Design a protein around this ligand. Structure first.
Ligand SMILES: [Cl-]
Ligand SMILES: [Cl-]
Lengths: 264, 264
């Protein structure tokens, strides 16, 4: 019998999990998703994701694929999986895909949104889904300071010591910093990311926005190539994986990025 | 020695509490806030709220007052109090007020926003802070159908049986329904509300918006004076107390209502 390969759009609140990746030590998003899919499929299912997210990080645009011998209507993979999942994980859509699709290796870019709540006093609504930053932030100054990161660049100054890639070079396709009321949102897209690149970049933009560092400091850090000179890694709770690019031949759905009320 | 009367703006995620009031409940917002204030004041503190909220309901614009013999700087009533509160409750501001102020009796109106997530599939991010409604809604149709609620009206058809008020008559100051992407937001302001009035109005508005009841139905239910004819009470999860009106002489802070990214 045929082995079907299926892609899913997954959303999750990452606050009650210890990251995406399944392992034998702590609760993960992947384990809950695999248990729900196996219930529907009536066999053990293994999923492969576009981008693993660390503990506390959320997703609206995560994509996975899996193989199954189970033939089913689209309802099974959407309503059925969601009925079996906890309330903080959900399928957004299902698409059957060709055998040559791979949620990680077919992807050509990933995009993240980082949500900062900027006030002296901490927030209570979505408290583990926003990062509280105490001192006032100048979002326009952060925006202008971030534009130098566009294109192919050596991201050694924003790279964690644990990254195992052998090159620190990546291509940032866009970067935007905007204020929405008391919130400051960082939107960044690249082909791929070195370990903790997004949160490292946000951590330093935060020092520029608070006026602890100049507007040209990001250009300066980039040029100086040393992660010890850059700001501490920003907290996990404001980060969302919001979109993954794939070739148009796969025709995957593209529902709103969000999180929540933000526009595409 | 003076007795000081202090007002605070309070925000809370209601999902882990069984409503505001501590009476008859193991888990309440009021208990947590009174424990926090008693520790800062070094004496037992009792707070009085502008509008009690039911189990699961949220607040961004709640206001309380309390009396204390403790003379403290504004930081103790904000940072100090927040240090003694759980992560899902927070003080937004402090203001000393005259003796004649009462968070309930000085208020002239309360305003709520109700957030509906209107996709076929349920959400995962902010799952206990939005109401999932699976049938497609026509927000403009809901808006038009709601306007007959304006002004002084007998809200019998939208009142729960547990309401003990004399008169079911209240004054609806405004009501609007707008779509924001996949979300539908009901914004309603009245001098005061009867029990379950907001959630009962929203329940019937969603039936109209889904084309299950005619656009005239809200006016027909209003005139019928029988809550058994009206739709089921909408879920608590999407409801937020976002603002309370007080006379200008009190000069109370008016920070963003949200929740989250919604503009004022
Ligand atoms: Cl990161
Ligand atoms: Cl209500």
């Amino acid at each position: 019998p045929p082995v079907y390969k299926i892609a899913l759009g997954i959303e999750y609140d990452g606050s009650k999990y210890y990251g995406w990746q399944r392992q034998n030590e702590v609760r993960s998003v992947q384990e809950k998703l695999e248990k729900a899919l196996s219930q529907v499929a009536n066999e053990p299912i293994t999923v492969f994701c576009a981008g693993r997210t660390d503990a506390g990080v959320h997703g609206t645009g995560q994509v996975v694929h899996f193989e199954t011998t189970a033939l089913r209507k689209d309802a099974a993979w959407t309503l059925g999986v969601n009925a079996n999942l906890p309330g903080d994980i959900a399928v957004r859509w299902v698409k059957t895909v060709p055998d040559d699709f791979h949620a990680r290796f077919s992807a050509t870019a990933r995009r993240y949104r980082y949500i900062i709540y900027n006030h002296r006093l901490r927030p209570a609504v979505l408290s583990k889904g926003v990062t509280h930053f105490y001192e006032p932030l100048d979002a326009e100054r952060m925006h202008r300071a971030a534009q130098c990161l566009l294109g192919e660049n050596d991201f050694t100054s924003f790279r964690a010591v644990q990254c195992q890639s052998r090159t620190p070079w990546r291509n940032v396709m866009h970067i935007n910093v905007t204020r929405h009321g008391p919130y400051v949102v960082v939107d960044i897209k690249a082909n791929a990311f070195v370990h903790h690149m997004v949160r490292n970049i946000v951590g330093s933009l935060m020092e520029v926005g608070a006026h602890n560092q100049p507007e040209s400091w990001i250009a300066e850090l980039l040029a100086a190539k040393d992660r010890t000179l850059a700001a501490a890694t920003a907290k996990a709770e404001g980060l969302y994986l919001v979109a993954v690019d794939y070739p148009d031949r796969y025709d995957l759905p593209k529902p709103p990025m969000g999180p929540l009320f933000l526009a595409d």
